[PDB]
Design a protein around this nucleic acid. Structure first.
Ligand SMILES: [Mg+2]
Ligand SMILES: [Mg+2]
Ligand SMILES: [Mg+2]
Ligand SMILES: [Mg+2]
Ligand SMILES: [Mg+2]
Ligand SMILES: [Mg+2]
Ligand SMILES: [Mg+2]
Ligand SMILES: [Mg+2]
Ligand SMILES: [Mg+2]
Ligand SMILES: [Mg+2]
Ligand SMILES: [Mg+2]
Ligand SMILES: [Mg+2]
Ligand SMILES: [Mg+2]
Ligand SMILES: [Mg+2]
Ligand SMILES: [Mn+2]
Ligand SMILES: [Mn+2]
Ligand SMILES: [Mn+2]
Ligand SMILES: [Mn+2]
Ligand SMILES: [Mn+2]
Ligand SMILES: [Mn+2]
Ligand SMILES: [Mn+2]
Ligand SMILES: [Mn+2]
Ligand SMILES: [Mn+2]
Ligand SMILES: [Mn+2]
Ligand SMILES: [Mn+2]
Ligand SMILES: [Mn+2]
Ligand SMILES: [Mn+2]
Ligand SMILES: [Mn+2]
Ligand SMILES: [Mn+2]
Ligand SMILES: [Mn+2]
Ligand SMILES: [Mn+2]
Ligand SMILES: [Mn+2]
Ligand SMILES: [Mn+2]
Ligand SMILES: [Mn+2]
Ligand SMILES: [Mn+2]
Ligand SMILES: [Mn+2]
Ligand SMILES: [Mn+2]
Ligand SMILES: [Mn+2]
Ligand SMILES: [Mn+2]
Ligand SMILES: [Mn+2]
Ligand SMILES: [Mn+2]
Ligand SMILES: [Mn+2]
Ligand SMILES: [Mn+2]
Ligand SMILES: [Mn+2]
Ligand SMILES: [Mn+2]
Ligand SMILES: [Mn+2]
Ligand SMILES: [Mn+2]
Ligand SMILES: [Mn+2]
Ligand SMILES: [Mn+2]
Ligand SMILES: [Mn+2]
Ligand SMILES: [Mn+2]
Ligand SMILES: [Mn+2]
Ligand SMILES: [Mn+2]
Ligand SMILES: [Mn+2]
Ligand SMILES: [Mn+2]
Ligand SMILES: [Mn+2]
Ligand SMILES: [Mn+2]
Ligand SMILES: [Mn+2]
Ligand SMILES: [Mn+2]
Ligand SMILES: [Mn+2]
Ligand SMILES: [Mn+2]
Ligand SMILES: [Mn+2]
Ligand SMILES: [Mn+2]
Ligand SMILES: [Mn+2]
Ligand SMILES: [Mn+2]
Ligand SMILES: [Mn+2]
Lengths: 89, 269, 44
RNA sequence: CUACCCUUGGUCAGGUUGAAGUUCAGGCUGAAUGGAGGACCGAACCGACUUACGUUGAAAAGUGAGCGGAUGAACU
RNA sequence: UGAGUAGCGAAAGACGGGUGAGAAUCCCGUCCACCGAUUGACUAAGGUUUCCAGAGGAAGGCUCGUCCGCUCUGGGUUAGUCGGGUCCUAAGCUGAGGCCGACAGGCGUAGGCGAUGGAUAACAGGUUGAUAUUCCUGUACCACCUAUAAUCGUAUCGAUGGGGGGACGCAGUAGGAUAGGCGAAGCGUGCGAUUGGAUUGCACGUCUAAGCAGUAGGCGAGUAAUCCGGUACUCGGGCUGAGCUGUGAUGGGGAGAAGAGAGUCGUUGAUUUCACACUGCCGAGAAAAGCCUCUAGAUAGAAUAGGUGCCCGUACCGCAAACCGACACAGGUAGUCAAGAUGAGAAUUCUAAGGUGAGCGAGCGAACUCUCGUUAAGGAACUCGGCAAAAUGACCCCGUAACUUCGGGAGAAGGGGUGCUCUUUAGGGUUAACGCCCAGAAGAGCCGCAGUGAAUAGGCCCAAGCGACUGUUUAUCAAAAACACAGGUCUCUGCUAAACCGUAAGGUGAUGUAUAGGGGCUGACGCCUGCCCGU
RNA sequence: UGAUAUUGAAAUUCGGCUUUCUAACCCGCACCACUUAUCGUGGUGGGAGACAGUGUCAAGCGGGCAGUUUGA
């Protein structure tokens, strides 16, 4: 559905630089289109469209002692609006 | 047949053909385009019988060897020069407007007449079947089968004799000097084929042969005994065993290779 | 000095990949064997 | 990796010599235009002829100095 | 044990100021130095977080370590219009049916997959600690949809189908442009403290896509599933492409310095960038789609805004400490860019842009070994052998033998000049001459041992053997007298050819057909090539 | 290379020998159709023919290739 296509809001100084210029960074499920991200961005937030940029992230790496291993892949896509104003603390 | 001046020590002896006969249109007509990629190897990729490989690219001629569109008269467009065949071959455009590449017998002006089939016009130019043509005709491009496209004489300079007429099939003398009865439903083009002097051009330099699909050939007398019957032995060596031998054994200095009980044995003498 | 092994992902996955393995009878047998030993990795 | 091959691409500073053809004075000779060739010097690049160094090495075949080919059977 | 021994992997550093428990090694600063057809700039492979910021120092780092490509924490890769996919095919791979097969399976038609190639619509500026033709400032384009339709109604889409086109090799010359280069007479700054000078000193001299306009190259009427194709009979300059410039993009951006809103010129040389174009050559130089057509057949009708446009790749290293070599290894690694003086140059020496000082050091200045340089007199006496080293060297002129297959031998051998100044002065192109290029010829005069004053540039001749020559060879002890070679001869082979792989089809030969194709021997060319019918 | 199955008809010399015709068998050729396909399957038209090809057996040739021996 649409509630599943969005994942988590993303907080970083880069994400903050995006909020300051009407752009909202957003983690997403994989195989989702930029389009489904806009649809979800509307149906979830009652604001709409403009650009919906997307990138992929290869799974990283981390050790936990003896067990080195990878993380999960990311699919973060930031979205910026023709009109609206999403935020919550 | 131009003779090159000995400017370079390599190929000071060279002789190119004086391709003034090529005359009209250097470019080939786009009537014949597809194929062939080069292949010294057979399918399955093993090097089946070769000292072949390399060489320049060649677009394929689609010469109408069959003369199957017999009937309408046609005239030469140009004379050209095929690479894949030794002889240069002339183009000929039909009254239908369809054009076709045809092998070009010695002589043959920029405009020419004779067509194919039925009609008895035994005076140079395109083939006529079969029992026809006078005995002693200059005759060439013979077919071994009806409508097969004329498998026999081609090359550059080539010839045949039309002597004899035994019934069912007509007798003919091949340039090899073989005399045998080809079937009398054969297409058979008139005059002697192509360049008279393709054989007189000495290659000169090494690798001009490699511009053709000719890899250099290593003698069997050298090499090693596992590689060849002639192989091994200190220094330069005698053949040793009687009868010089090909690789894979078997005598090769006068041993008939014609098949026992051949199907066409009755039709030749 | 150019050592043997100049890596190239296309060719590595060809001849050594899951598909090329499965395509022959013997590659299936190979996969059977590797799976039998319990290798954490099978084909590339 | 390497040997041949099949498709499809790419590279080759610069100087030099002056084939044929053609063009004026000639009963095949001088001058011009002309731009040939597994042609000539010489970097790139490709090689490995000599030597020294190296020989529990920088290196399981190299380095320095010279050396051979470099429009070709070229190099990749 | 060897032993506190060998080693610590090409290389130029010094000091000052910080930091810190602690500095030869970290950060900052000046100077010094090294590469600069690269040790710089950009990418393709390949590697996959090594990228970034802040912290750390046990281990990794050949020393040290406050530092790191190491460690902990947190974060970084943004595309309709770039590369790939939703486009096309080559070699090859696969191969519905199908032919072969003890099985397993081999082969193969249609068809499909397959880029290293064809086709493909955006640029310039700005910005972060880490991204950018991707973010945003500006200005554009392509496809599609939906809303208005001037013009057509049993025009408009046209085929998976024939047309056209795409569609090509190799060499060589000249020319048109264009970038980048060099100097001045606008334009920003400074004006010296070591004797001198002030039209003197250094620095710069722009702007893109699309979109308007205009410029070396190439070459009709009508009749015979289609009005196009092809084919042929009468009738005297414009159809196709096109570098680049002028304009508008822009009253924008950009910019040099510094005192807390500013310049766009002129001359000059000039490409390997822009044409396989042109010309010449024979070895005769991919396919398919996009595109344009003509019909077969389809369907009511087909410039002004709003809107729609997906998936993958995007960090960083990439002649390297991050790639292949077990290493932070003197090796290997496709391509693009490539400025100045000097020059014929991508050689040579020194410098731009920009990068770096090489992950052990301080001393001393023995033998010996290495890498350099020099050496009286002699000059191959050395040695298996002139091995090694010397000597030769660029440019202009002069002068060149035996021999020869007349091309050659030839840079033969060898001979002379070369610097700076000053005059008269004469050629080339560019322009209204002016001046700008590059560059000879004569005359006097000067200075040094020496004038291509550095670096970088052939030693040559005489005679013999072997091979004709360019080329190939034993990766890692042999590059040759060995193989190859063009030429020669012998032999097989009449075309489901012989020969060859699998003997199964299938396939090479060859989409070739005795001027051809296989095998053997010889090996340019010249003169030839004899005597003898067990296998 | 020979007998022999596949493998037929009809004429001459003494079941053999030599010719002719097709209903076998065969075309790596022409046409049609499957099919917008050089594979294949049929269909005709020629071509060739009881030989060729194949299976069974038999006799040669055969360092191409294999296992080996080659004394003290
Ligand atoms: Mg573009
Ligand atoms: Mg594809
Ligand atoms: Mg570099
Ligand atoms: Mg190091
Ligand atoms: Mg100069
Ligand atoms: Mg340092
Ligand atoms: Mg020391
Ligand atoms: Mg000296
Ligand atoms: Mg001696
Ligand atoms: Mg002279
Ligand atoms: Mg000379
Ligand atoms: Mg002697
Ligand atoms: Mg070699
Ligand atoms: Mg066969
Ligand atoms: Mn993306
Ligand atoms: Mn040998
Ligand atoms: Mn043998
Ligand atoms: Mn022998
Ligand atoms: Mn001997
Ligand atoms: Mn395992
Ligand atoms: Mn995977
Ligand atoms: Mn050469
Ligand atoms: Mn060496
Ligand atoms: Mn060297
Ligand atoms: Mn050279
Ligand atoms: Mn000590
Ligand atoms: Mn010590
Ligand atoms: Mn000791
Ligand atoms: Mn010691
Ligand atoms: Mn030491
Ligand atoms: Mn070091
Ligand atoms: Mn300090
Ligand atoms: Mn302190
Ligand atoms: Mn410093
Ligand atoms: Mn870092
Ligand atoms: Mn340490
Ligand atoms: Mn694309
Ligand atoms: Mn197939
Ligand atoms: Mn099947
Ligand atoms: Mn195919
Ligand atoms: Mn590509
Ligand atoms: Mn970056
Ligand atoms: Mn001063
Ligand atoms: Mn003063
Ligand atoms: Mn990047
Ligand atoms: Mn190693
Ligand atoms: Mn290295
Ligand atoms: Mn290389
Ligand atoms: Mn330069
Ligand atoms: Mn240099
Ligand atoms: Mn600098
Ligand atoms: Mn001395
Ligand atoms: Mn002396
Ligand atoms: Mn002397
Ligand atoms: Mn002497
Ligand atoms: Mn002595
Ligand atoms: Mn001596
Ligand atoms: Mn020497
Ligand atoms: Mn000289
Ligand atoms: Mn030689
Ligand atoms: Mn060797
Ligand atoms: Mn050697
Ligand atoms: Mn089989
Ligand atoms: Mn044996
Ligand atoms: Mn045994
Ligand atoms: Mn014994």
């Amino acid at each position: 559905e649409a509630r599943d296509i969005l994942k988590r809001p993303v907080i970083t100084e880069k994400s903050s630089e995006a909020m300051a210029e009407d752009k909202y960074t957003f983690d997403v499920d994989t195989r989702v289109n930029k389009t489904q991200v806009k649809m979800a961005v509307e149906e979830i937030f009652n604001v709409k469209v403009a650009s919906v940029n997307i990138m992929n992230y290869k799974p990283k790496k981390k050790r936990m002692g003896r067990y080195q291993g990878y993380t999960n892949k990311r699919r973060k896509a930031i979205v910026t609006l023709k009109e609206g104003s999403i935020d919550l603390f | 047949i131009k003779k090159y001046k000995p400017i370079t020590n390599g190929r000071r002896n060279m002789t190119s053909l004086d391709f003034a006969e090529i005359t009209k249109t250097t470019p080939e007509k786009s009537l014949l385009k597809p194929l062939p990629k080069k292949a010294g190897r057979n399918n399955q990729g093993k090097l089946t019988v070769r000292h072949h490989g390399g060489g320049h690219k060649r677009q394929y001629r689609v010469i109408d060897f069959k003369r199957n569109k017999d009937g309408i008269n046609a005239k030469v467009d140009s004379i050209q020069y095929d690479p894949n065949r030794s002889a240069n071959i002339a183009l000929v455009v039909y009254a239908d407007g369809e054009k076709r590449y045809i092998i070009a017998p010695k002589g043959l002006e920029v405009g020419q007449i004779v067509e194919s089939g039925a009609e008895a016009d035994i005076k140079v130019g395109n083939a006529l079947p079969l029992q026809n043509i006078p005995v002693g005709t200059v005759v060439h491009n013979i077919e071994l089968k009806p409508g097969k496209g004329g498998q026999i004489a081609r090359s550059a300079g080539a010839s045949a004799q039309v002597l004899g007429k035994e019934g069912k099939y007509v007798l003919i003398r091949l340039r090899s000097g073989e005399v045998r009865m080809i079937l009398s439903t054969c297409r058979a083009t008139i005059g002697q084929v192509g360049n008279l002097q393709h054989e007189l051009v000495n290659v000169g330099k090494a690798g001009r042969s490699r511009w053709k699909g000719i890899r250099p050939t290593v003698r069997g007398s050298v090499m090693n005994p596992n590689d060849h019957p002639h192989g091994g032995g200190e220094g330069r060596a005698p053949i040793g065993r009687p009868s010089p031998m090909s690789p894979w054994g078997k005598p090769t200095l006068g041993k008939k290779t014609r098949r026992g009980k051949k199907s066409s044995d009755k039709l030749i003498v | 000095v150019k050592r043997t092994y100049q890596p190239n992902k296309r060719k590595h996955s060809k001849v050594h990949g899951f598909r090329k393995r499965m395509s022959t009878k013997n590659g299936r047998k190979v996969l059977a064997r590797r799976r039998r030993k319990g290798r954490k990795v099978l084909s590339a």
